[PDB]
Structure formats: structure tokens, C-alpha cells
Design a protein around this ligand. Sequence first.
Ligand SMILES: CCCCCCCC
Ligand SMILES: CCCCCCCC
Ligand SMILES: CCCCCCCC
Lengths: 48, 48, 48, 49
Amino acid sequence: VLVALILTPALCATMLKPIAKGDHGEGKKGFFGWFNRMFEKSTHHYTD
Amino acid sequence: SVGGILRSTGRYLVLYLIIVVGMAYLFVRLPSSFLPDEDQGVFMTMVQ
Amino acid sequence: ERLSGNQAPSLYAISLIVVFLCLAALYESWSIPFSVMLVVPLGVIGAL
Amino acid sequence: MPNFFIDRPIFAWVIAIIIMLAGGLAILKLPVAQYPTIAPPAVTISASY
Ligand SMILES: CCCCCCCC
Ligand SMILES: CCCCCCCC
Ligand SMILES: CCCCCCCC
């Protein structure tokens, strides 16, 4: 929790790459592209 | 005098290393003990 | 003498590392601390 | 505290490095075994006639 309150936020501000609005990694081509489309679809099933 | 040293710089970078090497020499040169012998106002004489 | 003796050099190395880190946190820079760290040999030379 | 270390990322790293360093030095000194003292202690009185 101390790492999550001190270090993790500091890194998230400095390291993480900017993500565009609406981008959920569905546009990716390969395994990750398939998994992101699969997971986003599984969330709709779950929420419903 | 401080203002003049800032203009030079290069000379005092070399003078620093001489002090660091001089320090390194004196360190190894100086013998090592644990605790000095103190005058306790008393001593003993062995007879064998 | 034989087992457990010369253990000072390592604790001095830890001290200089932990001092550098604490200085880096104070000034919020990896470079600035060295301005303070380079004064240590100017003091040690006198003691020697 | 989170907002403090977002502006001070080096401070955040310094806290992490010091913890990791302290841990590294502990590993050297720490003893090793299968279990700790889990067995209850016993005292034996031995006599001979
Ligand atoms: C991630 C698991 C979702 C499963 C939903 C099942 C509803 C028929
Ligand atoms: C002790 C770790 C120092 C790392 C310096 C990084 C400079 C960008
Ligand atoms: C900004 C980079 C920090 C370096 C961390 C070093 C960990 C031993």
C-alpha cells in the first residue's frame, strides 16, 4: 500500500505512455488484439 | 577571489584530485590499532 | 582477530550511498547531491 | 501523500532504493533453516542405580 501510494503514482505520471480517448487496444493486430476484443466482449456479457 | 576561481575552474579540478590522492596515501600510510593504552594511576610488575 | 574483523569499509560505503540518496530526495535531483558529496575528502584530509 | 510524490518522483525512488538496500543487507546476515523453533522445549533427568 505504501509502494502504491508513494512509488506507483510517481511512475504512472513519468513512465506510462499516453492513451487516446476510446482506445481499448482493439486496434492492435496479433494475440493482444484478439484478447482485447475477447475481453471487452466478455465485459458486456458480465455487465448484462 | 571566489568570483575569480569560477572563471578558472579547470585548475582547481586538478588540485582537488591531488588532495584525494594525498588523502588516499595518508589513509594507507597511517597504522591501525583499537584503543590506546591509558594512564590509570596504577600498574603491575610480574616476577617469574 | 581471525574471524569477524575488518567490516568498516562496507558500512562507510553504505553511509555514502544512503547520504547521496537522502540528498537526492531533499534537492529532487541525482546531480545536485554531488555538490555536497565532493566536500567529504576536504574534511578527511585534515583528520588524517 | 500521492500528490506529493507525483511532483517528487526522485524522492519516491529514494524511499524504494533505501528499503531494497536495507533488504539486501538483511539477506546476508539472516540465518537459514527448514523450520524455526516450532518444537516445544524438553528437559530430561538421567539417573543410574
Ligand atoms: C467474464 C465472465 C463473463 C461470463 C458471463 C456469463 C453470462 C451468460
Ligand atoms: C542510484 C540510482 C541513480 C540513477 C540515476 C538516473 C538518472 C536519470
Ligand atoms: C530513475 C531510475 C531509478 C533507478 C533505480 C535503481 C534501482 C537499484
